[PDB]
Scaffold this active site. Structure first.
Site, PDB file in Angstrom:
ATOM      1  N   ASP A  57       0.850  -1.207   0.000  1.00  0.00           N
ATOM      2  CA  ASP A  57       0.000   0.000   0.000  1.00  0.00           C
ATOM      3  C   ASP A  57       0.880   1.249   0.000  1.00  0.00           C
ATOM      4  OD1 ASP A  57       0.775  -0.678   2.750  1.00  0.00           O
ATOM      5  OD2 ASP A  57      -0.857   0.725   3.428  1.00  0.00           O
ATOM      6  N   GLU A 115       5.355   5.937  -4.460  1.00  0.00           N
ATOM      7  CA  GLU A 115       6.520   5.625  -3.603  1.00  0.00           C
ATOM      8  C   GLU A 115       6.746   4.106  -3.657  1.00  0.00           C
ATOM      9  OE1 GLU A 115       6.248   6.995   0.423  1.00  0.00           O
ATOM     10  OE2 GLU A 115       8.352   6.857   0.828  1.00  0.00           O
ATOM     11  N   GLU A 203       1.119   6.990  11.436  1.00  0.00           N
ATOM     12  CA  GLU A 203       0.133   6.249  10.649  1.00  0.00           C
ATOM     13  C   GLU A 203      -1.138   5.985  11.446  1.00  0.00           C
ATOM     14  OE1 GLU A 203       1.432   2.723   8.507  1.00  0.00           O
ATOM     15  OE2 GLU A 203      -0.603   2.064   8.136  1.00  0.00           O
TER      16      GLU A 203
END
Length: 312
Positions: A57, A115, A203
Protein backbone atom coordinates in the site's frame (compact mmCIF):
# COMPACT_ATOMS: atom_id res chain seq x y z
CA UNK A 1 -25.05 16.84 -21.24
CA UNK A 2 -22.76 19.59 -19.88
CA UNK A 3 -19.74 17.27 -19.24
CA UNK A 4 -16.50 16.86 -21.18
CA UNK A 5 -14.09 13.97 -20.46
CA UNK A 6 -10.35 14.43 -20.87
CA UNK A 7 -8.15 11.33 -21.08
CA UNK A 8 -4.64 11.91 -19.81
CA UNK A 9 -2.20 9.33 -18.53
CA UNK A 10 -2.88 5.92 -20.13
CA UNK A 11 -1.11 2.82 -18.95
CA UNK A 12 1.71 4.84 -17.40
CA UNK A 13 4.06 2.99 -15.04
CA UNK A 14 5.65 4.20 -11.84
CA UNK A 15 8.42 1.76 -10.84
CA UNK A 16 11.80 1.55 -9.22
CA UNK A 17 14.87 0.21 -10.97
CA UNK A 18 17.44 0.83 -13.61
CA UNK A 19 15.88 2.83 -16.44
CA UNK A 20 12.57 3.03 -14.47
CA UNK A 21 11.11 6.08 -12.67
CA UNK A 22 8.83 6.44 -9.67
CA UNK A 23 7.22 9.39 -11.43
CA UNK A 24 5.76 9.93 -14.90
CA UNK A 25 5.03 13.22 -16.66
CA UNK A 26 2.98 14.21 -19.65
CA UNK A 27 1.47 17.20 -21.44
CA UNK A 28 -2.25 17.01 -22.08
CA UNK A 29 -4.78 19.18 -23.87
CA UNK A 30 -7.49 20.67 -21.67
CA UNK A 31 -10.11 23.09 -23.02
CA UNK A 32 -8.85 26.68 -22.87
CA UNK A 33 -11.89 28.41 -21.30
CA UNK A 34 -12.66 27.58 -17.66
CA UNK A 35 -15.01 30.50 -16.98
CA UNK A 36 -18.08 28.18 -16.92
CA UNK A 37 -16.48 25.26 -15.12
CA UNK A 38 -18.47 24.21 -12.06
CA UNK A 39 -16.70 20.96 -11.14
CA UNK A 40 -13.63 18.97 -12.27
CA UNK A 41 -13.40 15.36 -11.05
CA UNK A 42 -10.14 13.43 -11.46
CA UNK A 43 -10.35 9.66 -11.73
CA UNK A 44 -7.34 7.41 -11.09
CA UNK A 45 -7.49 3.80 -12.37
CA UNK A 46 -4.81 1.40 -11.22
CA UNK A 47 -4.52 -1.69 -13.41
CA UNK A 48 -2.97 -4.57 -11.47
CA UNK A 49 -4.05 -7.92 -12.97
CA UNK A 50 -2.72 -11.21 -11.61
CA UNK A 51 -0.53 -9.76 -8.86
CA UNK A 52 1.74 -8.11 -11.42
CA UNK A 53 2.26 -4.93 -9.35
CA UNK A 54 4.13 -3.90 -6.22
CA UNK A 55 1.74 -5.37 -3.74
CA UNK A 56 2.29 -2.90 -0.90
CA UNK A 57 0.00 0.00 0.00
CA UNK A 58 2.11 2.84 -1.38
CA UNK A 59 1.82 6.61 -1.09
CA UNK A 60 0.96 8.13 -4.45
CA UNK A 61 0.08 11.56 -5.79
CA UNK A 62 -0.78 13.65 -8.87
CA UNK A 63 0.54 17.15 -9.65
CA UNK A 64 -0.22 20.00 -12.17
CA UNK A 65 2.55 22.31 -13.25
CA UNK A 66 2.18 26.09 -12.98
CA UNK A 67 2.97 27.18 -16.56
CA UNK A 68 4.72 30.39 -15.43
CA UNK A 69 6.68 29.38 -12.28
CA UNK A 70 7.40 25.78 -13.24
CA UNK A 71 6.31 24.58 -9.78
CA UNK A 72 4.41 21.29 -9.32
CA UNK A 73 1.18 21.54 -7.28
CA UNK A 74 -0.24 18.43 -5.66
CA UNK A 75 -3.85 18.13 -6.79
CA UNK A 76 -4.65 14.69 -5.29
CA UNK A 77 -3.12 12.01 -3.07
CA UNK A 78 -3.98 8.38 -2.52
CA UNK A 79 -2.66 5.14 -1.03
CA UNK A 80 -2.66 2.15 -3.39
CA UNK A 81 -4.61 -0.90 -2.34
CA UNK A 82 -2.64 -3.93 -1.26
CA UNK A 83 -2.20 -6.66 -3.89
CA UNK A 84 -4.89 -5.47 -6.33
CA UNK A 85 -5.75 -2.31 -8.34
CA UNK A 86 -8.97 -0.25 -8.38
CA UNK A 87 -10.91 -2.61 -10.57
CA UNK A 88 -13.70 -2.89 -7.94
CA UNK A 89 -14.35 0.77 -8.83
CA UNK A 90 -15.26 0.89 -12.51
CA UNK A 91 -14.17 4.52 -12.89
CA UNK A 92 -11.29 4.45 -10.41
CA UNK A 93 -10.52 6.54 -7.37
CA UNK A 94 -12.22 9.94 -7.51
CA UNK A 95 -10.74 13.25 -6.29
CA UNK A 96 -12.35 16.66 -6.88
CA UNK A 97 -9.74 19.01 -8.41
CA UNK A 98 -12.08 21.97 -9.23
CA UNK A 99 -9.83 24.16 -7.09
CA UNK A 100 -7.18 23.86 -9.77
CA UNK A 101 -9.42 24.66 -12.76
CA UNK A 102 -7.27 27.76 -13.45
CA UNK A 103 -4.31 25.51 -14.08
CA UNK A 104 -6.23 22.73 -15.93
CA UNK A 105 -6.54 24.80 -19.08
CA UNK A 106 -4.87 24.48 -22.47
CA UNK A 107 -1.80 22.24 -22.85
CA UNK A 108 -1.07 21.31 -19.29
CA UNK A 109 1.79 19.30 -17.68
CA UNK A 110 0.79 16.60 -15.12
CA UNK A 111 2.90 14.26 -12.99
CA UNK A 112 1.92 11.02 -11.26
CA UNK A 113 4.19 9.51 -8.57
CA UNK A 114 4.17 6.31 -6.51
CA UNK A 115 6.52 5.62 -3.60
CA UNK A 116 7.13 2.17 -5.13
CA UNK A 117 10.32 0.30 -4.40
CA UNK A 118 9.92 -2.59 -6.89
CA UNK A 119 10.40 -2.88 -10.66
CA UNK A 120 6.85 -4.31 -10.88
CA UNK A 121 5.60 -0.86 -9.72
CA UNK A 122 2.08 0.39 -10.35
CA UNK A 123 0.33 1.27 -13.61
CA UNK A 124 -2.32 3.97 -14.01
CA UNK A 125 -4.79 5.67 -16.32
CA UNK A 126 -6.09 9.10 -15.27
CA UNK A 127 -9.05 10.99 -16.69
CA UNK A 128 -10.97 14.15 -15.84
CA UNK A 129 -14.66 15.01 -16.03
CA UNK A 130 -15.22 18.76 -16.54
CA UNK A 131 -18.79 19.79 -15.67
CA UNK A 132 -19.91 23.11 -17.10
CA UNK A 133 -22.65 25.45 -15.79
CA UNK A 134 -22.68 28.66 -13.75
CA UNK A 135 -20.24 28.76 -10.89
CA UNK A 136 -20.94 31.25 -8.20
CA UNK A 137 -17.56 32.91 -9.09
CA UNK A 138 -16.36 33.17 -12.69
CA UNK A 139 -12.67 33.49 -11.76
CA UNK A 140 -10.38 31.56 -9.44
CA UNK A 141 -6.68 31.41 -8.55
CA UNK A 142 -4.72 28.98 -6.43
CA UNK A 143 -1.21 28.86 -4.95
CA UNK A 144 0.54 26.59 -2.46
CA UNK A 145 1.11 27.69 1.09
CA UNK A 146 3.20 24.62 2.06
CA UNK A 147 4.12 21.38 0.29
CA UNK A 148 6.03 18.72 2.23
CA UNK A 149 4.74 15.90 0.05
CA UNK A 150 7.24 14.43 -2.32
CA UNK A 151 6.86 11.12 -0.45
CA UNK A 152 5.54 9.82 2.88
CA UNK A 153 9.00 10.21 4.57
CA UNK A 154 9.51 13.72 3.11
CA UNK A 155 6.70 14.91 5.30
CA UNK A 156 7.18 17.12 8.31
CA UNK A 157 8.95 15.22 11.12
CA UNK A 158 6.58 14.55 14.00
CA UNK A 159 7.69 14.24 17.61
CA UNK A 160 11.24 15.44 16.74
CA UNK A 161 12.50 18.98 16.21
CA UNK A 162 12.75 20.36 12.61
CA UNK A 163 13.38 23.60 10.69
CA UNK A 164 10.51 23.45 8.12
CA UNK A 165 8.41 26.67 7.69
CA UNK A 166 4.90 26.01 8.68
CA UNK A 167 4.24 29.65 9.10
CA UNK A 168 3.71 31.86 6.02
CA UNK A 169 2.18 35.18 5.17
CA UNK A 170 -0.61 35.24 2.58
CA UNK A 171 -1.78 38.31 0.67
CA UNK A 172 -5.22 38.09 -0.81
CA UNK A 173 -6.09 40.41 -3.69
CA UNK A 174 -8.49 43.22 -2.87
CA UNK A 175 -11.10 42.07 -5.50
CA UNK A 176 -11.32 38.60 -3.85
CA UNK A 177 -14.93 37.70 -2.98
CA UNK A 178 -14.40 34.31 -1.37
CA UNK A 179 -11.17 32.65 -0.10
CA UNK A 180 -10.38 29.30 1.45
CA UNK A 181 -7.68 26.72 2.21
CA UNK A 182 -7.35 23.22 0.76
CA UNK A 183 -5.24 20.80 2.82
CA UNK A 184 -4.28 17.15 2.32
CA UNK A 185 -2.40 15.52 5.25
CA UNK A 186 -1.39 11.94 5.89
CA UNK A 187 0.85 10.29 8.46
CA UNK A 188 3.60 7.66 8.32
CA UNK A 189 5.20 5.69 11.13
CA UNK A 190 4.55 3.42 14.07
CA UNK A 191 6.71 5.51 16.47
CA UNK A 192 6.45 5.12 20.25
CA UNK A 193 5.11 5.92 22.72
CA UNK A 194 1.95 4.18 21.57
CA UNK A 195 -1.51 5.53 22.17
CA UNK A 196 -4.20 3.13 23.55
CA UNK A 197 -4.84 0.26 21.20
CA UNK A 198 -1.09 -0.09 20.40
CA UNK A 199 -1.28 2.81 17.93
CA UNK A 200 2.02 4.37 16.98
CA UNK A 201 2.63 7.68 15.18
CA UNK A 202 1.91 8.99 12.62
CA UNK A 203 0.13 6.25 10.65
CA UNK A 204 -2.06 4.96 13.46
CA UNK A 205 -2.28 7.56 16.25
CA UNK A 206 -5.47 9.63 16.09
CA UNK A 207 -4.60 13.39 16.26
CA UNK A 208 -6.28 16.78 15.81
CA UNK A 209 -4.09 19.51 14.29
CA UNK A 210 -4.88 23.21 13.96
CA UNK A 211 -4.48 26.02 11.44
CA UNK A 212 -3.93 29.42 13.09
CA UNK A 213 -4.84 32.54 11.14
CA UNK A 214 -3.21 35.77 12.41
CA UNK A 215 -2.09 33.61 15.35
CA UNK A 216 -5.57 32.59 16.34
CA UNK A 217 -6.45 28.94 16.32
CA UNK A 218 -9.19 28.80 13.69
CA UNK A 219 -9.55 25.41 11.96
CA UNK A 220 -9.17 21.89 13.38
CA UNK A 221 -8.15 18.85 11.32
CA UNK A 222 -9.21 15.62 13.01
CA UNK A 223 -7.21 12.67 11.58
CA UNK A 224 -9.63 9.96 12.65
CA UNK A 225 -11.10 6.65 11.62
CA UNK A 226 -12.44 6.64 8.05
CA UNK A 227 -13.93 3.10 8.08
CA UNK A 228 -11.23 1.17 6.22
CA UNK A 229 -13.18 -2.06 6.56
CA UNK A 230 -16.01 -0.63 4.44
CA UNK A 231 -13.69 0.13 1.50
CA UNK A 232 -15.38 -0.83 -1.78
CA UNK A 233 -11.95 -2.00 -2.83
CA UNK A 234 -12.53 -5.01 -0.64
CA UNK A 235 -10.34 -7.52 -2.42
CA UNK A 236 -7.04 -6.55 -0.80
CA UNK A 237 -6.49 -9.79 1.18
CA UNK A 238 -4.06 -10.82 2.55
CA UNK A 239 -2.84 -7.28 3.07
CA UNK A 240 -3.68 -5.47 6.26
CA UNK A 241 -6.39 -3.39 4.64
CA UNK A 242 -9.11 -3.31 7.27
CA UNK A 243 -7.72 -1.47 10.34
CA UNK A 244 -8.39 2.26 10.53
CA UNK A 245 -5.42 4.57 10.09
CA UNK A 246 -5.50 8.19 11.29
CA UNK A 247 -7.18 10.02 8.38
CA UNK A 248 -6.52 7.55 5.55
CA UNK A 249 -7.08 3.99 4.25
CA UNK A 250 -5.20 1.73 1.88
CA UNK A 251 -6.79 1.83 -1.51
CA UNK A 252 -8.51 5.19 -0.92
CA UNK A 253 -7.92 8.83 -1.70
CA UNK A 254 -6.51 10.94 1.12
CA UNK A 255 -9.31 13.37 2.17
CA UNK A 256 -9.24 16.97 1.03
CA UNK A 257 -9.98 19.45 3.86
CA UNK A 258 -11.61 22.72 2.99
CA UNK A 259 -11.48 25.68 5.41
CA UNK A 260 -13.29 28.88 4.43
CA UNK A 261 -11.50 32.09 5.42
CA UNK A 262 -13.17 35.14 6.95
CA UNK A 263 -13.90 37.83 4.38
CA UNK A 264 -12.37 40.41 6.69
CA UNK A 265 -9.01 39.09 5.47
CA UNK A 266 -9.59 40.14 1.84
CA UNK A 267 -7.26 42.94 0.83
CA UNK A 268 -4.88 42.18 3.72
CA UNK A 269 -1.82 40.08 4.36
CA UNK A 270 -2.49 37.43 7.06
CA UNK A 271 -0.38 34.72 8.71
CA UNK A 272 -1.01 31.05 8.37
CA UNK A 273 0.47 28.51 10.75
CA UNK A 274 -0.05 24.74 10.68
CA UNK A 275 0.18 23.51 14.32
CA UNK A 276 0.64 19.85 15.05
CA UNK A 277 -0.79 18.29 18.18
CA UNK A 278 1.93 18.04 20.81
CA UNK A 279 3.72 14.69 20.90
CA UNK A 280 7.24 13.47 21.59
CA UNK A 281 8.88 10.48 19.91
CA UNK A 282 10.80 8.39 22.55
CA UNK A 283 12.87 6.83 19.77
CA UNK A 284 11.96 3.23 20.72
CA UNK A 285 10.16 2.37 17.47
CA UNK A 286 11.41 4.49 14.51
CA UNK A 287 10.21 7.84 13.08
CA UNK A 288 6.95 9.65 12.26
CA UNK A 289 6.19 12.13 9.45
CA UNK A 290 3.18 14.08 8.15
CA UNK A 291 3.05 14.64 4.44
CA UNK A 292 1.11 17.85 3.93
CA UNK A 293 0.07 20.23 1.23
CA UNK A 294 -2.02 23.27 1.85
CA UNK A 295 -3.26 25.74 -0.80
CA UNK A 296 -5.07 29.03 -0.76
CA UNK A 297 -7.85 29.64 -3.28
CA UNK A 298 -9.25 33.09 -4.18
CA UNK A 299 -12.52 33.40 -6.10
CA UNK A 300 -14.13 36.47 -7.65
CA UNK A 301 -16.49 37.61 -10.39
CA UNK A 302 -13.81 40.03 -11.69
CA UNK A 303 -10.45 38.70 -12.95
CA UNK A 304 -8.02 38.20 -10.10
CA UNK A 305 -4.36 37.62 -9.51
CA UNK A 306 -2.97 34.69 -7.49
CA UNK A 307 -2.62 35.19 -3.78
CA UNK A 308 1.05 35.92 -2.75
CA UNK A 309 2.63 33.64 -0.21
CA UNK A 310 5.89 34.70 1.52
CA UNK A 311 8.10 33.56 4.34
CA UNK A 312 8.19 35.49 7.55
Amino acid sequence: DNTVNIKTFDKVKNAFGDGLSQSAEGTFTFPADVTAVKTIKMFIKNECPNKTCDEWDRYANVYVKNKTTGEWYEIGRFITPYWVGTEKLPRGLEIDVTDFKSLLSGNTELKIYTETWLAKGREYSVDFDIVYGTPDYKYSAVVPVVQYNKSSIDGVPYGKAHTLALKKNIQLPTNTEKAYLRTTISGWGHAKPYDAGSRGCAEWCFRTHTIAINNSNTFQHQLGALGCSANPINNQSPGNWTPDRAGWCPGMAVPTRIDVLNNSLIGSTFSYEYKFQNWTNNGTNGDAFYAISSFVIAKSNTPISAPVVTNL
